[PDB]
Design a protein around this ligand. Structure first.
Ligand SMILES: Nc1ncnc2c1nc(Cl)n2[C@@H]1O[C@H](CO)[C@@H](O)[C@H]1O
Length: 385
């Protein structure tokens, strides 16, 4: 029953996703708000601890006690140049506990400090409770995914987050391996198969080249930009609308934190509409000084605004091909991962770079990793009996 059940968890930098393989199919489990993905946010308030959508919804009112990006800190030393560089951009406090970073917050009126694995364990506990509410019984066995470039220290701290959360971690698998499992690319029989995973998320870009030889996976190359994602395209829309507001009303809104945040959430929503429509509308009542902001943007203008950012995604693809020592024609499959790969211009640029080749994109790109993890978790739990 519960002991024969296993879930797959995509523990992402900005969003997390949980799936279960039962009765021959994968089910991506919706949270209590009906969303198939949950923000990787933990808010500490005067009365409670919030996780997910509720934590993300109050980030404006409580920025110092809302933790996110814990995945950027997990398994790292305080002195690491990555940690020191990132700390300058977070509104929450990061402290040094014996060369290990801790996040310091105010919770129920008291100062508390948490290790990144403790923060990630709270997100994992939420994912476990989402699966438990869907199944009707507690599930404890899980497959958790990590980026392919995570070292042994980062993988061990992720397994520890899983232990703190009450999960029996069956295996820590690479995100591009889970994505290739989702598409059944390890079941093509005999012969080495070269797979390229194009992973464009909310805050990170990853390119992975895998070789699948008789079910055995091998990472040939990893390339990317740890500071490129969907939130950069949103900010390009924000800057455009701030300048458009200035041309129509002769008023600068950039300093008004509430006006910029409302504009940012609306731009994110409009960016998603531009993936299936050639135009999107912004309807913001009383944006600044009682002025309504009712405008529209074409997909063409959006593509112009992000043009340099979209084109920059092909340099790590070229870099991963050279590191892997493979030419384009040697890649058998192209897999899309991350919500931002839904952007039509991104798909067109990648397809043209691979000489008009078809892309694997039938599985919701923000769900493909949890999908494959859920498949692996089902196989692993069956072999355990
Ligand atoms: N339809 C979409 N068109 C464009 N971007 C999208 C879309 N859906 C999501 Cl999610 N994202 C973005 O993907 C990230 C999460 O994986 C977020 O940046 C989200 O906006």
């Amino acid at each position: 029953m519960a002991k024969a059940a296993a879930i797959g968890i995509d523990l992402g930098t900005t969003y997390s996703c949980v799936g279960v393989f039962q009765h021959g199919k994968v089910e991506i489990i919706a949270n209590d708000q009906g969303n198939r993905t949950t923000p990787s946010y933990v808010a500490f308030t005067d009365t409670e601890r919030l996780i997910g959508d509720a934590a993300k919804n109050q980030v404006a009112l409580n920025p110092q006690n809302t933790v996110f990006d814990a995945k950027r800190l997990i398994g790292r030393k305080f002195g690491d140049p990555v940690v020191q560089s990132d700390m300058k951009h977070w509104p929450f406090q990061v402290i040094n506990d014996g060369d290990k970073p801790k996040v310091q917050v105010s919770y129920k009126g008291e100062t508390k400090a948490f290790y990144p694995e403790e923060i990630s364990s709270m997100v994992l506990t939420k994912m476990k409770e989402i699966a438990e509410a869907y199944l009707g019984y507690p599930v404890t066995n899980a497959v958790i995914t990590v980026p392919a470039y995570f070292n042994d220290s980062q993988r061990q701290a992720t397994k520890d987050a899983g232990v703190i959360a009450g999960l029996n971690v069956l295996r820590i698998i690479n995100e591009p391996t889970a994505a290739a499992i989702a598409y059944g690319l390890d079941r093509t029989g005999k012969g080495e198969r070269n797979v390229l995973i194009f992973d464009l998320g909310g805050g990170t870009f990853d390119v992975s080249i895998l070789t699948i030889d008789d079910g055995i996976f091998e990472v040939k190359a990893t390339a990317g930009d740890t500071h490129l994602g969907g939130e950069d395209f949103d900010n390009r829309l924000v800057n455009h609308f701030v300048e458009e507001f200035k041309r129509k009303h002769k008023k600068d809104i950039s300093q008004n934190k509430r006006a910029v945040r409302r504009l940012r959430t609306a731009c994110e929503r409009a960016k998603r509409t531009l993936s299936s429509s050639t135009q999107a509308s912004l309807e913001i009542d009383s944006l600044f000084e009682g002025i309504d902001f009712y405008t529209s943007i074409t997909r063409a203008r959006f593509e112009e605004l992000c043009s340099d950012l979209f084109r920059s995604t092909l340099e790590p693809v070229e870099k991963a091909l050279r590191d892997a020592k493979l030419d384009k024609a040697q890649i058998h499959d192209l897999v899309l991962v991350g919500g931002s790969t839904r952007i039509p211009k991104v798909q067109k640029l990648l397809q043209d770079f691979f000489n008009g080749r078809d892309l694997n994109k039938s599985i919701n790109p923000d769900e493909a990793v949890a999908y494959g993890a859920a498949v692996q978790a089902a196989i692993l739990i069956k072999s355990t009996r």
